[PDB]
Design a protein around this ligand. Structure first.
Ligand SMILES: CCC(=O)NS(=O)(=O)c1ccc(NC(=O)COc2ccc(Cl)cc2C(=O)c2cc(Cl)cc(C#N)c2)c(C)c1
Lengths: 405, 537
């Protein structure tokens, strides 16, 4: 077709992110994939007068490798195109399926003036040789500008299946398509092939249940007898929960902690303490009132390492005002790898944010930058990449959330 | 001699214009010598005599072969030239090179001058040869080729070189060619006569594109003296390092000596600089003279002997295993050797004391493993199998319950003491039968006095006033007293947020003298339970 002019944001220069080192196997796969793309005119080699750069790497499913480009920096510096809105229905469905449509993009030429900004580098081993430089001639996968510039074409190709199915909902984000229905699994799945074959007919491809993502309740411990230690730990968590629910009281329990009693000594709960403990439980039976999502604010996702393979998390915009909270557990075959578990949690959580709000949250990761950067790619599978920062989990937040039900 | 090579389109930074600095007048000698040179360059088609038009200009100097040599200061032009793709700053490491039957090193002589400049950019490199008598115009020239000392030259030359080799590489898949600055290191497993034949092929393919080169005699022969190493065909070694010998050492002398010694620590084992570093205390000037103590003398004398040791390396075989072994030489200091077979090291190294506010040996080991791993992927595009001095249970007991995500690639245990262990472990529950200390601390952060103390269920109490102290310090000192005055088992109640940190991390090393004292005391107890409780009424 033709190319629509595209610019960076005022005063923004192009990305110059350094390429991280890669294993011999990933380099060989990238060399193979790129020599093919070059032959088809998708990408071309470039000269030294191009100083920009975006990092690239290689992910899997079983046999072949897929190329993944991190255009996070280019995306930020890329102008705005205000894409489609967000169907408040998609999130309310019953079953959503994700489809990779990145192949669609290779058929549309990228404005020649913008091409240089997509430069990337395949590194070598031991510095033996300079990297192999390339830039895109066509809409690249992962750049926010692609889905947008292909919108008119995507609506045109989805219209028939859409008019045919007034009920089902389709929502697009980056390279993926999120389709949901209320049908019956069998009819749902087979109804997807109908869509895929329709996509196959142009060039595109060769289970999530939103009605289960519900904020979890904090349940307090229950005991036959209570020791001084028991009462101190209960009082510490409640003292924190008060930051969320102002009606929680600890005066009665705290009165039971006067004196200097051995930590193991048993203390009889007075009637007052009894009531106070009961009012607090009653308050905790529901999420706190007043929390609503603001579109002019960033979405934040925090994760704590609970141990024994469990990982808790919260999504919010303002402190103590959670939009969603949950617990993700280690799955079959990760019993010795924290990194693999964290990457699985991030993707799962990022996916959830997309379905509900149409954007990805900013993550606070309880891991060291070096440890994360050296291995996160080993287990990534999404076409997209969220933003992230590394933190130092406060001992309390952790203690309170493992109290979840 | 010039090349048929396509030119690279170059541009000036957004907005600014070509340079216009005036020509620094020179004597009649230096002028006549420049005229000589610039006349020969005109013959070779390297520069072009120009006229009126060109408004730009760059200063030209004359320096001294015992003759004169041209020098053009492009400092200004450079700051007006666009940015280019960063020329690589990584240097291959001999531990990651594959052994070859034959190796020929070729340096492209007059690299730069041999490559054409973007025709639309030449005008910006105009310079002027003065004249004895002023007021007379002077000779005007501009560059037709990559100028020596110009910002873009290294990058444009490297790129060109790459384009010219692509075909040859595609035709000879088994041949390996290293590119470094304007040097090619070519290697094969062909029989010496065949190799020499393929080399001459390459040489003529380069000559074809204008790049001239060293033939068989006017060359370089092994062992090759490259970046501080000596490469032989069956192995490699490091160029011997020499420590001066004087009766009078200045502060500067000591700092350079300390540096060389520090570097040598990667390769040699027992290199020490403690007593020599002690020499810099309170120094008042670089040129100051510091007499050497006995210790410092012995230290230095001992290092000279170590440096005369034959440390050699071996090259990489992609058919054998890659293995790395680690040792804890001291708190926070580790040594490592990466090898393929017992006693044949590919490379060695040492990570200096990584101190801080607080960590634990198991943590530092983890970081050493990650640094070595990032290093291995760069060198060999692969991760080694580790041999760590730590019980599988210690690891499993730490990572299992540590608040931070952590991991070690595929490894194996090796009982080569001292092993890395957990120095202590807080109880998961209160201790039945052990005294319970209720500790508190507070102090005027202004007067820096204040106090901290405890009171137990058994009746024991105490309070100490601290002159010139702080908040966190009173809290910590509180905990410290309890640990000191208690028996082999204890329960400790504190409202300190910091102790809460000690619960989540359980460190064994720290900057703070206090924390240290606490750690020492925590390691002594047989059982310790630490509990945190909110402060206010
Ligand atoms: C008397 C026998 C003899 O010396 N044989 S030989 O042909 O000269 C020969 C053959 C291989 C080797 N070397 C090897 O096997 C391993 O080394 C190499 C393996 C492959 C390649 Cl392409 C180069 C080298 C280098 O020695 C080398 C590397 C770098 Cl980055 C700079 C310089 C630099 N500068 C040299 C040597 C040192 C000499």
């Amino acid at each position: 077709i033709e190319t629509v002019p595209v610019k960076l944001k005022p005063g923004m220069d192009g990305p110059k992110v350094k390429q991280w080192p890669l294993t011999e196997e990933k380099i060989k796969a990238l060399v193979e994939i790129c020599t093919e793309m070059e032959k088809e005119g998708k990408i071309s080699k470039i000269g030294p007068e191009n100083p920009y750069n975006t990092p690239v790497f290689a992910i899997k499913d079983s046999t072949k490798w897929r190329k993944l480009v991190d255009f996070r920096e280019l995306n930020k510096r890329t102008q705005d195109f205000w894409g489609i809105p967000h169907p408040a229905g998609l999130k309310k469905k019953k079953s959503v399926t994700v489809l990779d449509v990145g192949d669609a993009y290779f058929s549309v030429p990228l404005d020649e003036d913008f091409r240089k900004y997509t430069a990337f580098t395949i590194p070598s081993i031991n510095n033996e040789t300079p990297g192999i430089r390339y830039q895109y001639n066509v809409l690249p996968q992962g750049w926010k500008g692609s889905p947008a510039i292909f919108q008119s074409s995507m609506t045109k190709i989805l219209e028939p299946f859409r008019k045919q199915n007034p009920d089902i909902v389709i929502y697009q984000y980056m390279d993926d398509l999120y389709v949901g229905s209320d049908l019956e699994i069998g009819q749902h799945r087979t109804k997807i092939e109908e869509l895929r074959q329709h996509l196959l007919r142009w060039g595109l491809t060769t289970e999530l249940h939103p009605d289960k993502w519900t904020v979890q309740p904090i349940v307090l411990p229950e005991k036959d007898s209570w020791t001084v230690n028991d009462i101190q730990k209960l009082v510490g968590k409640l003292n924190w929960a008060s930051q969320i629910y102002p009606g929680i009281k600890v005066r009665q329990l705290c009165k039971l902690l006067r004196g200097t009693k051995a930590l193991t000594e048993v203390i009889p709960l007075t009637e007052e303490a009894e009531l106070e403990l009961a009012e607090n439980r009653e308050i905790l039976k529901e999420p706190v009132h007043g929390v609503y999502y603001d579109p002019s604010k960033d979405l934040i996702a925090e994760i704590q390492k609970q141990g024994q393979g469990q990982w808790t998390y919260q999504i919010y915009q303002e402190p103590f005002k959670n939009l969603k909270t949950g617990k993700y557990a280690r799955m079959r075959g990760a019993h010795t790898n924290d990194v693999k578990q964290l990457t699985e949690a991030v993707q799962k959580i990022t996916t959830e944010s997309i379905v509900i709000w149409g954007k990805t949250p900013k993550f606070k990761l309880p891991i060291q930058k070096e440890t994360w950067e050296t291995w996160w790619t080993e287990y990534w599978q999404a076409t997209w990449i969220p933003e992230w920062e590394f933190v130092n989990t406060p001992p309390l937040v952790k203690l309170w959330y493992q109290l979840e039900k | 001699p010039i090349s048929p090579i396509e030119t690279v389109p170059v541009k000036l930074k957004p907005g600014m214009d070509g340079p216009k600095v005036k020509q620094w007048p020179l004597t009649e000698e230096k002028i006549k010598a420049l005229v000589e040179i610039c006349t020969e360059m005109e013959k070779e088609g390297k520069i072009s005599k120009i006229g009126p038009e060109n408004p730009y200009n760059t200063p030209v100097f004359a320096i001294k072969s015992t003759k004169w040599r041209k020098l053009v200061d492009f400092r200004e032009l450079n700051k007006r030239t666009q940015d280019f793709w960063e020329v690589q700053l990584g240097i291959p490491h001999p531990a990651g090179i594959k052994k070859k039957k034959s190796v020929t090193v070729l340096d492209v002589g007059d690299a730069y001058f041999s490559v054409p400049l973007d025709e639309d950019f030449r005008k910006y490199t105009a310079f002027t040869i003065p004249s004895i008598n002023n007021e007379t115009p002077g000779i005007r020239y501009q560059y037709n080729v990559l100028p020596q000392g110009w910002k873009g030259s290294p990058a444009i030359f490297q790129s060109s070189m790459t384009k010219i080799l692509e075909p040859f590489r595609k035709q000879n898949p088994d041949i390996v060619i290293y590119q470094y600055m304007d040097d090619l290191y070519v290697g094969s497993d062909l029989e010496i006569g065949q190799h020499r034949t393929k080399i001459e092929e390459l040489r003529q393919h380069l000559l074809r594109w204008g790049l001239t080169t060293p033939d068989k005699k006017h060359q370089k022969e092994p062992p090759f003296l490259w970046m501080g190493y000596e490469l032989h065909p069956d192995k490699w070694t490091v160029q011997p390092i020499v420590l001066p010998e004087k009766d009078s050492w200045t502060v500067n002398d000591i700092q350079k000596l300390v540096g060389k010694l520090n570097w040598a620590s990667q390769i040699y084992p027992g290199i020490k600089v403690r007593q020599l570093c002690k020499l810099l205390r309170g120094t008042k000037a670089l040129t100051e003279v510091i007499p050497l103590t006995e210790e410092a003398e012995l230290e230095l004398a001992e290092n000279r002997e170590i440096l005369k040791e034959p440390v050699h390396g071996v090259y990489y075989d992609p058919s054998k295993d890659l293995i790395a072994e680690i040792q804890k030489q001291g708190q926070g200091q580790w040594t490592y050797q990466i090898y393929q077979e017992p006693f044949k090291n590919l490379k060695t190294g040492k990570y200096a004391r990584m101190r801080g506010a607080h960590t634990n040996d198991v943590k530092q080991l983890t970081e050493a493993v990650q640094k070595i791993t990032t290093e291995s992927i760069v060198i060999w595009g692969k991760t080694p199998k580790f041999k760590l001095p730590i019980q599988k249970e210690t690891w499993e007991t730490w990572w299992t319950e540590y608040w931070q995500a952590t991991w070690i690639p595929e490894w194996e245990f090796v009982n080569t003491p001292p092993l890395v262990k957990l120095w202590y472990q807080l109880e998961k529950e209160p201790i039945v039968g052990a005294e319970t200390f209720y500790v508190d601390g507070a102090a005027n952060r202004e007067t820096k006095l204040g106090k901290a103390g405890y009171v137990t269920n058994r009746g024991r109490q105490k309070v100490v006033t601290l002159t010139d102290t702080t908040n966190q310090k009173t809290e910590l000192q509180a905990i410290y007293l309890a640990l000191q005055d208690s028996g082999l088992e204890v329960n400790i109640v504190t409202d300190s947020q910091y102790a809460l940190g000690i619960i989540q991390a359980q460190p064994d090393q720290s900057e703070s003298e206090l924390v240290n004292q606490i750690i020492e005391q925590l390691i002594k107890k047989e059982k310790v339970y630490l509990a945190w409780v909110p402060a206010h009424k």
